[PDB]
Design a binder for this molecule. Structure first.
Ligand SMILES: OC[C@H]1O[C@H](O)[C@H](O)[C@@H](O)[C@@H]1O
Ligand SMILES: OC[C@H]1O[C@H](O)[C@H](O)[C@@H](O)[C@@H]1O
Ligand SMILES: OC[C@H]1O[C@H](O)[C@H](O)[C@@H](O)[C@@H]1O
Ligand SMILES: OC[C@H]1O[C@H](O)[C@H](O)[C@@H](O)[C@@H]1O
Ligand SMILES: [Mg+2]
Ligand SMILES: [Mg+2]
Ligand SMILES: [Mg+2]
Ligand SMILES: [Mg+2]
Ligand SMILES: [Mg+2]
Ligand SMILES: [Mg+2]
Ligand SMILES: [Mg+2]
Ligand SMILES: [Mg+2]
Lengths: 387, 387, 387, 387
């Protein structure tokens, strides 16, 4: 039951199942995985493809010769298996040179290096077939208020993404960028901390059509925000290029639990939205098998990601298909929300006495919204206490 | 010492000093204030002006005759005193008819009523001299996931603000709109929950130049965000039309404490930013004297708002004027943050071997940022342990 | 399906279904309910009993004659219907006289009044059959640091509960006290903010055996704490006298959603714990039907409270009864957690070389805990994707 | 100005200034420090002493010979310099064998090993002069609900601390234990998550007089709690054995900023409480110089810890010594809070008609608390805008 196949478009970062379990207070609990082995094991689980940072695939500081040997091995696992690489990204956060940022480091020479490191990996990503290039500015930010002039830092951030867009357009590459927001950790505050701030920033870039967002469930929840609502606003803007699925239990450190763990009802409403809106991009899992687990547990946690997506998809489809739920949606006037408020125009509205002068405010105030009955039908479907 | 005068542009809502102290668990502890009395008492404290909701000034349901008597009394207090009215707003949240929203209520007839109520008060605000019209969509949102289709709700929100912009432009009014974000309370989640989401939304309106943000200190802190950083992004976008100053102790209910209470260091960095960026708009206090206080305490809390702004202004000016701080800023390379990363252009950067091939990553990694010494100088200035 | 009956011991406060919907920003949306009507409607839904504050039943300031008429009406609804009154409490928070607290108000005369008001309602509660008397110190606390000397306030809090214990013991009443913690709202910080602080405080009272806790789901979640863990510690101490069930979406204002809404997985683990530990007290719902709802929605929300408890009970029972889950629990060594670490004693442990000198740390480090497979079985049972 | 001397009792963990800057997303940015060098550098800064984990001083897995060489070097730096070692603790969190806990690991053999590792370091701590032995159960907890039966885990936690108390009493050691709470990180939820839960747990131990708390500023703030209030409750119980001072900006990952950073007003009220209550224990800094810093920044951040304590001490002393503040405290009735509510006894209170029958509730309700004027005097003193 609930068996994933490549058509479900489930994808995984090399850094997810490959996380060795080193955390701020503890050493690694698992050995390093060979990327070739992860490709083959994920293929057998029913995954559609993999993603990577440059440094997940090619050890930092590798010669041009060593680099080619790592890429060739990886390509032949893709060719043998035929896993896809739909997305790639840059590691601008692990090496000590990035301790104050990549694109917004105060030192100019570090910012130039960050751009050259990124451009080198765009070339590789395009060769392997990636459609989306993600940027997570995990070191862009500050612990203290004087350390970063944020207007200048946003100028530098805009400069960097503008240069990246000039690069891809001059090369003729068919690849788009997706900014992944996070509010904090590892910096005290990170720039562009939510989906909203990232969407707003994109609108000031020279070629906004090249850029969208890669929101992550747990990151928006680290600010206590409603993740389905934020995804809805990204869809409404035409900017949901990619998505990171995982779980998070509230406002605390970034947990990266397996999808379905954490806020289960938010996961239900997210899947309902993605499916009913026809999102066609990868369902990418950015998660960490807990460091309590051995390698059997790594693969069980990865399988659980896909399983929980497939169960929630089934329950959301059943919810929307239920005639009793359609009747409830009409009783709560969700259909009236889709009608224009004033398609008759401003002048008609101003002359309409039934909209103000003769509006019966007390009758309208007395109508119940019937929202609790609707939400209990949704609870019943989620729990399988009806079909 | 630290005496406010009208040139400091301090303003107050009628609903602030006039809050009677009714909270979710308690009855009012203070009598209602006459708006005429608040104007006169604020004038004597050194305030520049007042702001209002329609329902603060004119009791809901008032006849056209009663309405004119309330406005005439209020205008003559302004004329006698000569207080300014720089901003006004609409109450689309108190009456039970708005229990599911104004602009995004599921019922169409409520949405039309909300627009007519707003338009009536724009006319009045323009008559009294307001430059900014604020919208706080406090009821726009949901407690449960099925109650609100958020893409349709954003269509309705866009429709409403587009109609407002068509109204002011057809009337020839010189007034701009400012959206005030809040993440939650009184709804479980409120639409456009942060400064970033509001900035992003504005860019999809038909006439974006008419709209900006009115951020509030405590609202962004209810999402755990860095308020000076968010203000910096609003300034960078050209959208800081107005600001609400107050205090908040972390992630919890909206406290609306007096400015300076709550996160004191964030208040210091906010004042440093506003003054050094040359913000010229009103310094508006959206605060609630705690319901423990009698009327003497109301006016003492209001005076403390202005006093704390003036003290912080002095300390921030002293910080920036200190040659030892200028030297610290150079040691942390804040001046290098303002230089373009690659004004030599993309092709020059790609051919620069000192940016990648010959970049000494380990030397760059070893440089300290000297951020702690800078932050301790800022602490010393804030505390007056140097000048 | 999932039909509640009186044997399920579901109870409701008069103030829950009777909440008129007035919040910090809005007027009431529903008329006041007659307590007699709530008793009869809850009886028909399958409730076991009701609870009350003094002021829910007898209007504040009522004469001794008026008081008796309200009590007589209420008793005859109980007698006709035969609903139980298992718990009662005092309103020490609504009236303006309590704006700085009841038991810990700075004014001594208010503290004496608070004690006399409480004692009067203990007499009534005992007459109606209550086994537990709850105290929620919602006004005990502060918005600012100088307002409350917290050591003196804890002396006064101890004095008050000691006097209450002296009163009940001198009267021969068979009633115990339960302290209900809350971290904030309506005060900036409330004293005894969590289950842990309340348990610690009880141990300094003169007769600790008379006092326990009444934890509320949403209150502990307002501090981001794990509610099942806190309930486990209260059970371990022998102090879980009563419980408030409801839902809360994270760290924000107190939502009091219907049980099952909010953190659904935490609700599953809570019901699993209560049932497997044999909790025999009332399952009390302290919830507010959202003010969007009319009276049909009030009763639907109340029915949903009980329904969700009964569904979760069924899924947790199925989880624990599944032999595949029992095998998973053994694979994760939950059975070894129940064995004493060192029943052989300190001297034996010190002389055991297999515990340190010859302990193979690397073999032990390599064992996986198999926690993810266990948690996915729990997810499958919760969702009804196995039985 | 504000120069620390050994009489100020400032202490530092070896792991604080010695933190190499490795975080969840990044490699170390600083070389390892020799403990001998930290002792000498801290002595020159004016520190009173140092603290350590076993593994900070003796590399894990060291032979008995190697162990003695590390201890001898360290002792001679203490003897030459004469720094104190007032506290020590055990590392039960870094090694992979502790991935599921030390004292509450599901595997019994790990729990026995954890106890033997702890006992070995108690012997050493007593030899070096430590008065307090801290336990931070950073791995005791869970990411998922089924992984840990919390009642059994609390039995095992009690068993372990009881065995430790039996050990120290049988040896005749003059050392007490202090439990350091933390709500989460690195586990999803940690057992005994706040000061309150730790105080409650102590009361169930066999010899409660041997155990107290070591609260940390930032840990309680990770739950949004008021740290001075929690310290007040620990003092009221007689259990504040030790304290960790640092800074934290709200609810997020554990930042361990330098003391004074983070919530500055809470730091003021904390120092006011510690000094006015006569706390005589070490002022211990558990902080991490940010990984942006080189070694000059490490020592500047450490000096700033002590400086900010000394400045806040001066401002709090000036606040309490100001006759205008004493008058404000009387106006807010802080002196009435210290009088017993009912030293005349229960029977006198019940017969006092001025406490209920003839209590003028409306006059009492009308008195203002004057809390805002008091808090603005506190703000003025903190900022040095009066003396
Ligand atoms: O490349 C982007 C990825 O980089 C890092 O691993 C982040 O932790 C993860 O959030 C993000 O998706
Ligand atoms: O008009 C806008 C104002 O309306 C309401 O009173 C809000 O509580 C306040 O945040 C806002 O500034
Ligand atoms: O009597 C105790 C009750 O009183 C109040 O209504 C509180 O809001 C609720 O939390 C509590 O259970
Ligand atoms: O030994 C106790 C110490 O151990 C760990 O380093 C903790 O991170 C710190 O909070 C604590 O004070
Ligand atoms: Mg993450
Ligand atoms: Mg991610
Ligand atoms: Mg507010
Ligand atoms: Mg506001
Ligand atoms: Mg509640
Ligand atoms: Mg309750
Ligand atoms: Mg810490
Ligand atoms: Mg600590």
């Amino acid at each position: 039951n609930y068996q994933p196949t490549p058509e479900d478009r489930f994808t995984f970062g090399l850094w997810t199942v490959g996380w060795q379990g080193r955390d701020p207070f503890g050493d690694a609990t698992r050995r390093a995985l060979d990327p070739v082995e992860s490709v083959r094991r994920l293929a057998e689980l029913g995954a559609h493809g993999v993603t990577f940072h440059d440094d997940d695939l090619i050890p930092f500081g590798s010669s041009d010769s060593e680099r080619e040997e790592h890429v060739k091995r990886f390509r032949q696992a893709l060719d043998d298996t035929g896993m896809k690489v739909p997305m790639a990204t840059t590691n601008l956060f692990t090496h000590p040179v990035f301790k104050d940022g990549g694109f917004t480091a105060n030192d100019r020479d570090v910012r130039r290096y960050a751009l050259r490191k990124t451009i080198r990996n765009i070339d590789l990503a395009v060769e392997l077939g990636a459609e989306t290039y993600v940027a997570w500015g995990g070191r862009e930010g500050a612990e203290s208020g004087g350390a970063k002039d944020v207007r200048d830092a946003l100028d530098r951030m805009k400069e960097a993404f503008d240069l990246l867009g000039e690069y891809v357009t001059s090369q003729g590459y068919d690849i788009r960028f997706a900014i992944e927001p996070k509010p904090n950790e590892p910096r005290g505050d990170i720039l562009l901390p939510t989906v909203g701030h990232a969407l707003a920033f994109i609108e000031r870039l020279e070629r906004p059509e090249l850029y969208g967002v890669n929101p992550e469930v747990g990151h928006e929840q680290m600010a206590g925000l409603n993740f389905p609502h934020g995804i809805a606003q990204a869809l409404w803007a035409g900017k949901l290029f990619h998505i990171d699925l995982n779980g998070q239990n509230g406002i605390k450190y970034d947990q990266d639990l397996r999808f379905g763990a954490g806020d289960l009802r938010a996961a239900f409403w997210l899947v309902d939205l993605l499916e009913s809106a026809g999102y066609s991009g990868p369902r990418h899992f950015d998660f960490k098998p807990p460091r309590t687990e051995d390698f059997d547990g790594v693969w069980a946690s990865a399988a659980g990601c896909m399983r929980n997506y497939l169960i929630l998809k089934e329950r959301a489809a059943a919810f929307r298909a239920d005639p009793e739920v359609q009747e409830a949606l009409r009783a709560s006037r969700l259909d009236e929300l889709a009608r224009p408020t004033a398609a008759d125009g401003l002048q008609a509205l101003l002359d309409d006495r039934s909209a103000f002068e003769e509006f019966d405010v007390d009758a309208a105030a007395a109508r119940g919204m019937a929202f609790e009955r609707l939400d209990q039908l949704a609870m019943d479907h989620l729990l399988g206490a009806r079909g």
